[PDB]
Amino acid sequence: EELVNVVDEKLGTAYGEKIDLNNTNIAAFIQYRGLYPTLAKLIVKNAPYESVEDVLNIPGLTERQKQILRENLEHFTVTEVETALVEGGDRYNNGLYK
Amino acid sequence: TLTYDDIVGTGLANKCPTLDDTARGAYPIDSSQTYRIARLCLQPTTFLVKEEPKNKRQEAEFVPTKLVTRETTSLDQIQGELKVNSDGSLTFVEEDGIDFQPVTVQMAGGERIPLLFTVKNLVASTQPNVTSITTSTDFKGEFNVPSYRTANFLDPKGRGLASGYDSAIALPQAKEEELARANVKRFSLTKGQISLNVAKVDGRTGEIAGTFESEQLSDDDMGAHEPHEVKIQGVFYASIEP
Amino acid sequence: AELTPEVLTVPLNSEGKTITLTEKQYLEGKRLFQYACASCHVGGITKTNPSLDLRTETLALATPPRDNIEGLVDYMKNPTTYDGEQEIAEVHPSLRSADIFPKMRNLTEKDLVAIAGHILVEPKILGDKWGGGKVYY
Amino acid sequence: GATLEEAWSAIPEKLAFYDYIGNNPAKGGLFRTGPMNKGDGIAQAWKGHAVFRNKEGEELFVRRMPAFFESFPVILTDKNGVVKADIPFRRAESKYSFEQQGVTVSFYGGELNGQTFTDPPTVKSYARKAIFGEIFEFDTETLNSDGIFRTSPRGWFTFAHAVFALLFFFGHIWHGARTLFRDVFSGIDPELSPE
Amino acid sequence: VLNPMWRQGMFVLPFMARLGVTGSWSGWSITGETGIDPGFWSFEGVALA
């Protein structure tokens, strides 16, 4: 019977160390060679992935794109979708600007 | 035929489309036709808040409430593929649209009960063996109701969920525990459940209107108070196309 | 004395060559940067889309590399997202698209090289104050 | 030649206490009506010095709260002023959160002694209360404290022979002036024009 | 039901009922009604009066 903050806790999972495909703000996508712009719109769109790799099998991904993801696969992780983190279409615009 | 400069101000854009009394003429559904919905609209009128019954255990009540925020209530522009699965029943799966209007009605007492009138992630279906939508047909299904507020949001005094001061703050050496309710802000997720019966249908237009009744929950307020139950009533239009 | 020669010297090509610079060009850089418009872009952020900044690192991770006194030139000539996937020419000042953003007409390879050098140079002095806004101000 | 434990369990009660911002006279409030006790409460005992360890093992310090602030964000700086831990506000772009940097707390001396706490919540907590100096255990129930500081006698007394003395010089200026001009006191003297 | 005026230590409001003022401009009554709110002449009135 000990209620606890959700974001704070999920900051304790691998979510805080890497990029979370299913939750993480779409903004943390620029920090790598050519990912942000489009790949992200597809990374972020496209259902939530149970496995970190199911990224590679995304409908219509390009022969090059496919590559990139593979290449960057290093930094992606996953944790249960977080209701509090995804609701409000925050993932597109978290409220965090420079 | 009406321009925005013609309808703005009437507080009409909050009341949505009617179908004149040339209805009852069922819409010819195929089973050979894909079919989708165009701007499904739910205009409401009756907000009832199930009265937090006193400790006594005899039939909890559903009091009537007064609307506050003028006209910021109705919801439409909802669209979604209208599935025609086996046994000839129609299931409508909403993909997106304006559907989360935040309203705050004033309870019997002076209470200000705020809920998030919404029919999001909606999956409504009707009766089986139906090749035609008519005064007969009806739709029942589930919802998804987040919470009045987003993830960020700072209650006065700075606290918050995905941000915010994190504690008692104003009170430094105060007694930590018992404020848990306030400090850690939990975030709710619950089911809705509407019900849609048609009353006016046009055969060609794909248009169909009728009354609806949604029963959902109110404001979790991060953790503050246990939400209050709410039933919602009003008419709804919803044009159908192939 | 403080605005020294090499501190005014920056990377030219994705291959290493350095163009160093002058007090003259630098100036046009300032004059330019602002005239070429800091209106969204004032200081070192990006008001139309705050997610992208002009800090040295950010330009490196761009595609193609955009930290080259060269890079920025292609851009200003023809613009591309951080994908380098689709030309953003119609929504961004560019010589490719002058008829949209007038200020971009009177611009020249001389004027460009300058506004360019201004971008790769400013960080060197201002430190973080370049990328950040409000916070560092 | 002593256990870091025997070390702090060595330090004397009363003294740790002095190192508790809660006695630093300034922190009070002009209307904060009472004795320092209906504030942090009744000090019952010293818990122990709280040294915060990194996940890497590095020792950290809670960057204290300077007398001027009633509010304050806890920050754990590397022994050399560097920043290795904090309690985020944005929390969506957190780079140094206790949880993502595995902060932790051990205790030497006090009553807590030789104990350590690991769970991200309590570790945090213990820190925020460390920003006050030496953590302690206050019985608040008895007097029913509020959770806000008050100022020490020394504090009041000063503010006393303060507004008091700052006024008296006005009496000085007033009587001195009514001592010397006891002449004009009545009227200006109907006679005029010379000067 | 279990908190009618008389327990709450009501002394003057008990009368507003005898005569007839059953409710307050706030949608409630002493019987425990709903939707029906008195005219100006409702508790508040009697007082504002």
Ligand SMILES: CCCCCCCCCCCCCCCCCC(=O)OC[C@H](CO[C@@H]1O[C@H](CO[C@H]2O[C@H](CO)[C@H](O)[C@H](O)[C@H]2O)[C@H](O)[C@H](O)[C@H]1O)OC(=O)CCCCCCCCCCCCCCCCC
């Ligand atoms: C209303 C009527 C007005 C009439 C107006 C008439 C105008 C005439 C003006 C003439 C006088 C004004 C100029 C006086 C300057 C005196 C310099 C001074 O301040 O002297 C400087 C020192 C201060 O020492 C302080 O000491 C502190 C700590 O040191 C001490 O404590 C440390 C530990 O923290 C160490 O232990 C250290 O060893 C130990 O010395 C810090 O170091 C500080 O930086 C340092 O300033 O004061 C001292 O020794 C001297 C003793 C102080 C006497 C003060 C007399 C009145 C004014 C002070 C009242 C302040 C409180 C007001 C309360 C509210 C209302 C009154």
Ligand code: CLA
């Ligand atoms: C007119 C008659 C009358 C009656 C029957 C009541 C009855 C009541 N009042 Mg009330 N009240 C009245 C007049 C009355 N009031 C007036 C005129 C005022 C304005 C000053 C108030 C202000 C008031 C408040 C603020 C409250 C009440 C409350 C109440 C209720 C609680 C009982 C209580 O407080 O009494 C207390 C009983 C006593 C104190 C008994 C002993 C007190 C005195 C009479 C003893 C000494 C009398 C005299 C001075 C002796 C000296 C004589 C001399 C020769 C030496 C009760 C229903 C309470 C309530 O229910 O909700 C608000 C309450 O909070 N009243």
Ligand code: CLA
């Ligand atoms: C706030 C400024 C102020 C003003 C406007 C007055 C005005 C007055 N005072 Mg007075 N007084 C003051 C401050 C002031 N006082 C202070 C701080 C004291 C210390 C107790 C006094 C003590 C005093 C006495 C005992 C008397 C007066 C009296 C008077 C009245 C007659 C004039 C006088 O006595 O000489 C004015 C005196 C001065 C202007 C002092 C000169 C300043 C010093 C000597 C200069 C040297 C300071 C030094 C160089 C600074 C170096 C700084 C260093 C510490 C770092 C007159 C109304 C008389 C009175 O009213 O009785 C009828 C009287 O008997 N005063």
Ligand code: HEM
């Ligand atoms: C005139 C001087 C300007 C220069 C030198 C300049 C330079 C740049 C550069 C280098 C980028 C890409 C950053 C990166 O990915 O590393 C960029 C992006 C961008 N710029 Fe500018 N810019 C200028 C003016 C403007 C103006 C006036 C606007 C106003 C519309 C603007 C709007 C944008 C937008 C919206 C982007 C993001 C592109 C996207 O991802 O859609 N810029 N700019």
